[PDB]
């Protein structure tokens, strides 16, 4: 049975009663010197009674594979490698340096934006000094800081042309009757749009505008549009380069907000749609690459006064495209109320409904919402009030579950008034009224 | 330690032996049937003879009890004292008792097993010494006065400590307390050991398995939002899932499917372990109900798989095994089911595997692609594998028929896959 | 240089360095001989106090030590010092310039091995005196016979045999006639640990991939194999209180307890020792004891006890996880700033580059304890930043 034979131990003899510990393995009181293999067997039995012989050695000699892989590995989650998506209800935030900390602000932060490709943040508040920071995870500084007197700005944003991408125009507007454009060129040249061509009796303010591309659809002069709000039901679409009134659209009932959804048509063609709400909450969905006339209209399931609508998932204002072929049909729409109830709608079946039911109607933050923005890829929704402290929630979607681990009570959010995302970095930025803008990042991106 | 607890240990050690008349009657008065002042006047022969009558009627309704007649319910058993004999024959005694207890785990709805087990309680003292197997054998009947009785007379083990405010209370212990009993792996390793003995005796049945599975999915539900606890709790539930599939009963096999589906939707597992689970639940699949449930659980297992490589090829030895257990027309009628469960990722991997490891019968893939709708990255990877297949083997009418179907819906997909690989002029050359 | 005012005394606050320790029994006691750089130290294992130190340093650093009953065999650059009660009792100069690597003690024959697969074995002049003092012979393993050495030991019930564990092969010896007896089979990867088993004549040996082979040397086979994904294994042990438990220690700071009667992981332990300082350098069960003594390279020694089971009927299937028991540590990086606490020269404070603060006690070296970073809560309403 042995694979080897020593051929030396069998010719040995040991007097076992020389000492105390080797004299118990005798068998008679007359035997003194014993043979070698007998000696091996005797002390082998002594070993087997000094530690017993368990069953796992004489078990064997090396529908099963579940047990085999389960006994192999420890970490039973694949998410170490790729993960390609978010994990629900527990996200991987970390904190970064406070983005206002280099050169602080004094008023609230009513607008906050990112450059679409360059690593640039824009901050704008009621103290009429629009600052621009270069932001990074360690120490983030102020590139420039334009100040403009007599115009406390409310909302301001970046813009690049889709065609030749070398324009980089800021647009800014406050409660006054003029807005400003800026071609940024690392002493500034800014223009003051105030020429209202068609309608001059519907703007007590310019304090709500968006910017959006469109195609010509007989030629392909892809160019900008400023979309300003009015007072009765009016939202006016201008030009961004020139300043011409392109046209306007009035909905019935008071405008509360609006958003822009593009959709591709062919390889090189696309179509823009404007979505607008009341306080009542019946929306108009009309394209405006042809003349602005309503092609769909339906009604939100609920809301007495709804406050803020934001589309996302594909491309939008906050996540813009660079090449014209890089533009994408959206997926998610979201409508938010003064009661706090945010409905979020899918838009892959709800172009057919004419009264669509919500995918989810969530309510976690109690008071009225002010800002809500999607991720650039459409997995996080970000909701925030302007009423109480720590009034922001993050929602994983398509599962439509609020993240539990963040934000806790101990997060230093402050009374939030604005929020924005990165175009790519997964770098999130929140601003409050007491001045500071803080910076987090999402480690999955 | 101190003297008081230092001899409370020896009091608990020798609680089984009666030392005088008062402790003798306080020990003898424990009974599953009669109350205290009735039970304190019974003798051993009385309960033995009515228990032997209960046993023989229980043995004609179940033919596997005459062995316990021969060795545990014999006439010498009323003289056999427990705590007077050595550790090896007390080991024989209580493993025989455990055999009886798992065997009579089913019969507790009917009173012959109550009168059969009450002499076993009164003589061999299982209500103090052999308490664990008793509790987790009769734990299924927790809304029953037999369990309220047996918990009123039991001395409570250190594991089942959540029940100690349910002794001598008329309320039966509730389902939430049963979950909080099941909610630590010190209890769970015990209960998986017990289920392993039930499997290798085939004493499994439809009520114990139902209760066990329901508490396991409730444990996973409580440990939903605890990632460390859930990852701690994997290798016991999956362990008895694999030990549960090794048996023959359709009920324990679909119970294994139940814990597998709820665990897969509880947390995202890895591709290798979910493929081993898929081939394991396939490798012992016999009855039709097991076929149906296993197909549902395979589809949901693959639906809860994220990350890249999710819709990749299942390999050859799992693919041919899936085709051996499940023919193609069963897949076709399951996809023809009107409820339409979401099975898109499994059907995507099935299409890529039938196109790569069989490459012969493409009527199947065309038919089921007509029968379901499917998303864009899935159909992109399918038509990429079809491009590679159409260039390795010569084109057929079926291949070009499904190709022109993918022309007829969503042209620019196969156009962009040709832009990745060649040109539509070259594809029309290979037409 | 030599001085004339200050004489050096002791390097306090130092527990381990990363050399695998050894253990020894005396009656029903247990002592742990650990290495600290150049001198070693002898703790006990019951209360884990210090007991002994070497009375004077070594020339080089100690590379390998072992322990029989009273005696401690230290091994550095060229020699092996047989020590008693922390006092050197006999040098043994080896017959080479090659640096010694490993050693083992059994019966009469001491056996040390250098760094070129050359094994000096020594023998006691009288089969009654206390330590091997006399050179017996010099075996030499050649590269035909196996790889370069990684351990050696005499596993039990073998009549004057020995087991050299190389990087590719296991090979026995009969040390009386100087003969090789049984080369083993071929092994396809580098093995790095081999510890014997308390069952008859088998040895568990773990590789650089995470598998443990269990070689049966009498049979010349392997019995089982424990596979573990991509773990650089470092230190095996077995538990000998009857209930069979294997324990592997992975240099990623892991300690995995395997059952062997049913091939199951009993409990894993993650990040027990720090990764970057070597991980689990040496971990062992005290024999006949349900405790574990681990030591890392990060200046830390720990004891983990196995509790009794809670299932009084089931027993060996339900195993309680290991608790944490006594441990002795210092900070694992060189200390930045140093103060003296009291006028009596009893306590002193260290703060190290690994950002920990310790209060060492230079009077009695079990009083040294880490200061704790648990903030007093702001009782004016604020939140801790």
């Amino acid at each position: 049975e042995a694979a080897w034979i020593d051929s030396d131990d069998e010719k040995i003899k040991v007097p076992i009663l020389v000492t105390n510990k080797t004299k118990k393995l005798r068998t008679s009181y007359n035997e003194s010197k014993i043979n070698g293999v007998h000696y091996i067997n005797r002390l082998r039995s002594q070993f087997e009674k000094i530690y017993p012989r368990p069953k796992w050695v004489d078990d064997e000699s090396d529908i099963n594979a579940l047990t085999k892989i389960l006994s192999t590995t420890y970490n039973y989650k694949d998410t170490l490698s790729n993960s390609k998506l978010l994990p629900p209800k527990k996200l991987d935030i970390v904190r970064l340096k406070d983005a206002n900390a280099s050169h602080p602000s004094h008023s609230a932060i009513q607008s906050l934006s990112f450059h679409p490709s360059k690593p640039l943040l824009l901050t704008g508040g009621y103290d009429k000094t629009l600052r621009i920071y270069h932001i990074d995870g360690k120490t983030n500084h102020l590139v420039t800081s334009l100040h403009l007197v007599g115009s406390p700005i409310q909302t301001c944003t970046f813009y690049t042309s889709l065609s030749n991408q070398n324009q980089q125009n800021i647009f800014t507007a406050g409660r006054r009757r003029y807005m400003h454009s800026w071609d940024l060129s690392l002493t500034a040249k800014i223009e003051k749009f105030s020429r209202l061509y068609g309608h001059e009796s519907t703007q007590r303010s310019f304090e709500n505008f968006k910017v959006a591309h469109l195609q010509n659809s007989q030629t392909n002069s892809v160019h900008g549009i400023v979309l300003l709000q009015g007072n009765n039901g009016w939202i006016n679409i201008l030009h961004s380069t020139s300043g011409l009134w392109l046209m306007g659209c009035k909905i019935e009932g008071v405008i509360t907000d609006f958003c822009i959804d593009y959709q591709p048509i062919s390889r090189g063609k696309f179509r823009t749609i404007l979505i607008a709400v009341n306080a009542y909450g019946e929306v108009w969905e009309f394209d405006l690459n042809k003349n602005g006339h309503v092609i769909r209209r339906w009604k939100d399931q609920g809301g007495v006064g709804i406050t803020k609508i934001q589309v996302g998932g594909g491309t939008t204002t906050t996540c813009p495209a660079l090449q014209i072929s890089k533009i994408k049909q959206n997926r998610w729409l979201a409508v938010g109320s003064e009661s706090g109830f945010v409905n979020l709608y899918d838009r892959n079946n709800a172009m057919t409904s004419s009264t669509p039911t919500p995918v989810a109607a969530l309510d976690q933050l109690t008071t009225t919402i002010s800002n809500l923005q999607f991720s650039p890829d459409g997995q996080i929704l970000c909701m925030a009030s302007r009423a109480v402290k720590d009034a922001l929630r993050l929602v994983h979607l398509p599962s439509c579950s609020v993240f539990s681990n963040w934000p806790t009570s101990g997060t230093p959010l402050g009374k939030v008034t604005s929020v924005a995302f990165s175009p790519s970095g997964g770098l999130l930025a929140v601003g409050n009224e007491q001045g500071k803008v803080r910076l987090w990042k999402l480690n999955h991106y | 330690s101190s003297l008081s607890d230092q001899l409370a240990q020896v009091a608990s050690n020798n609680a089984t032996v009666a030392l005088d008349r008062k402790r003798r009657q306080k020990l003898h008065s424990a009974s599953l049937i009669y109350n205290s002042k009735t039970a304190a006047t019974q003798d051993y022969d009385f309960i033995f003879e009515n228990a032997s009558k209960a046993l023989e009627e229980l043995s004609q309704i179940e033919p596997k009890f005459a062995i316990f007649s021969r060795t545990l319910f014999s006439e010498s058993s009323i003289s056999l004292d427990r705590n007077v004999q050595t550790k090896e024959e007390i080991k024989d005694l209580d493993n025989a008792i455990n055999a009886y207890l798992l065997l009579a785990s089913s019969k507790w709805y009917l009173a012959p097993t109550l009168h059969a087990t009450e002499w076993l309680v009164r003589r061999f003292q299982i209500h103090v010494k052999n308490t664990e197997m008793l509790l987790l054998s009769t734990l299924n009947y927790y809304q029953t006065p037999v369990f309220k009785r047996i918990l009123s007379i039991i001395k409570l083990p250190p594991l089942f400590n959540c029940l100690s405010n349910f002794v001598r209370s008329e309320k039966p212990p509730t389902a939430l307390t049963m979950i909080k009993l099941f909610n630590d792996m010190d209890f769970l390793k015990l209960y998986t050991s017990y289920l392993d003995q039930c499997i290798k005796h085939n004493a499994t049945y439809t009520n114990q398995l139902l209760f066990t599975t329901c508490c396991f999915i409730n444990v996973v539900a409580f440990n939903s939002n605890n990632d460390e606890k859930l990852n701690q709790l994997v290798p016991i539930l999956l362990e008895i899932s694999a030990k549960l599939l090794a048996s023959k009963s359709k009920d324990c096999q679909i119970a294994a499917h139940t814990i597998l589906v709820v665990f897969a939707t509880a947390l995202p597992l890895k591709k290798t372990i979910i493929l081993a689970a898929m081939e394991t639940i396939l490798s012992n699949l016999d009855a039709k109900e097991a076929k149906h449930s296993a197909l549902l659980t395979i589809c949901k297992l693959f639906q809860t798989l994220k990350g890249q490589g999710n819709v990749d090829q299942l390999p050859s030895k799992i693919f041919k095994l899936f085709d051996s257990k499940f023919d193609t027309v069963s897949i076709l009628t399951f996809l023809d089911k009107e409820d339409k469960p979401v099975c898109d990722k499994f059907i995507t991997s099935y299409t890529r595997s039938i196109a790569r490891y069989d490459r012969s019968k493409l009527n199947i893939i065309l038919s089921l692609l007509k029968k379901i709708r499917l998303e864009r990255y899935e159909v992109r990877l399918i038509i990429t594998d079809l491009i590679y297949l159409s260039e390795i083997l010569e084109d057929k009418s079926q291949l070009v028929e499904l190709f022109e179907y993918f022309i007829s819906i969503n042209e620019d997909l196969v156009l962009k896959c040709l832009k990745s690989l060649g040109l539509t002029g070259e594809l029309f050359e290979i037409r | 240089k030599n001085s004339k005012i200050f004489s050096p005394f002791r390097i306090i606050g130092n527990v381990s360095n990363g050399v695998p320790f050894a253990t020894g029994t005396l009656g029903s006691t247990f002592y742990i001989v650990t290495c600290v750089g150049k001198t070693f130290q002898i703790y006990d294992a019951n209360t884990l106090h210090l007991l002994f130190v070497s009375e004077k340093e070594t020339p080089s650093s100690i590379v390998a030590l072992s322990a029989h009953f009273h005696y401690v065999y230290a091994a550095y650059e060229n020699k092996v010092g047989i020590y008693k009660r922390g006092i050197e009792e006999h040098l043994l100069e080896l017959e080479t310039d090659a640096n010694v690597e490993h050693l083992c003690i059994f019966g009469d024959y001491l056996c040390a091995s250098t760094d070129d697969n050359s094994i000096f074995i020594y023998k006691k002049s009288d089969p009654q005196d206390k330590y091997p003092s006399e050179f017996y012979t010099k075996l030499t393993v050649t590269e035909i016979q196996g790889g370069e050495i990684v351990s050696l030991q005499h596993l039990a019930t073998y009549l004057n045999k020995l087991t050299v564990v190389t990087k590719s092969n296991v090979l026995l010896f009969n040390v009386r006639t100087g003969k090789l007896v049984f080369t083993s089979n071929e092994f396809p990867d580098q093995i790095t640990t081999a510890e014997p088993a308390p069952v008859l004549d088998i040895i568990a040996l773990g590789t650089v991939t995470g598998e443990v082979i269990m070689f049966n040397m009498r049979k010349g086979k392997r019995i089982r194999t424990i596979k573990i994904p991509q773990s650089r294994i470092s230190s095996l042990s077995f538990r000998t209180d009857g209930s069979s438990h294997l324990s592997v220690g992975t240099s990623s700071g892991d300690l995995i307890f395997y059952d062997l009667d049913r091939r199951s992981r009993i409990h894993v332990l993650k990040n027990i020792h720090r990764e970057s300082y070597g991980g689990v350098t040496q971990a062992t069960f005290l024999n006949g004891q349900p405790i574990i003594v681990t030591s890392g390279g990060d200046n830390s020694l720990k004891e983990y006890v196995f509790d009794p089971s809670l299932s009084q009927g089931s027993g060996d299937v339900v195993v309680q996880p290991p608790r944490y028991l006594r441990s002795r540590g210092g900070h694992s990086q060189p200390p930045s700033y140093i103060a003296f606490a009291d006028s009596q020269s009893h306590f002193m404070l260290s703060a190290s580059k690994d950002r920990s603060l310790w209060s060492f006690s230079l009077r009695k070296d079990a009083q040294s304890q880490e200061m704790s970073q648990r903030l007093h809560k702001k009782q004016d309403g604020g939140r801790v930043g």
């Binding site: 131990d9 010719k11 040995i12 003899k13 040991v14 510990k21 080797t22 010197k33 070698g36 000696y39 002390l43 002594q46 070993f47 000094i50 530690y51 | 330690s1 250190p158 594991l159 400590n161 959540c162 100690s164 405010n165 630590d184 010190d186 209890f187 | 029994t25 009656g27 029903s28 006691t29 247990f30 294992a45 019951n46 003690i105 059994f106 019966g107 009469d108 024959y109 089969p127 005499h154 039990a156 019930t157 073998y158 009549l159 004057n160 009386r176 005290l286 024999n287 006949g288 004891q289 405790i291 006890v305 509790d307 809670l310 608790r323 028991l325």
Partner: peptide, 28 residues
């Protein structure tokens, strides 16, 4: 009431160990 996960005073019981002294021999 939860399960009393409870430690105790631990004690080092008696060792019982094979020693290697009886593993050598000599030619007589």
């Amino acid at each position: 009431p939860k399960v009393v996960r409870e430690a105790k005073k631990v004690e080092m019981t008696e060792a019982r160990a094979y020693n290697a002294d009886a593993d050598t021999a000599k030619a007589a």
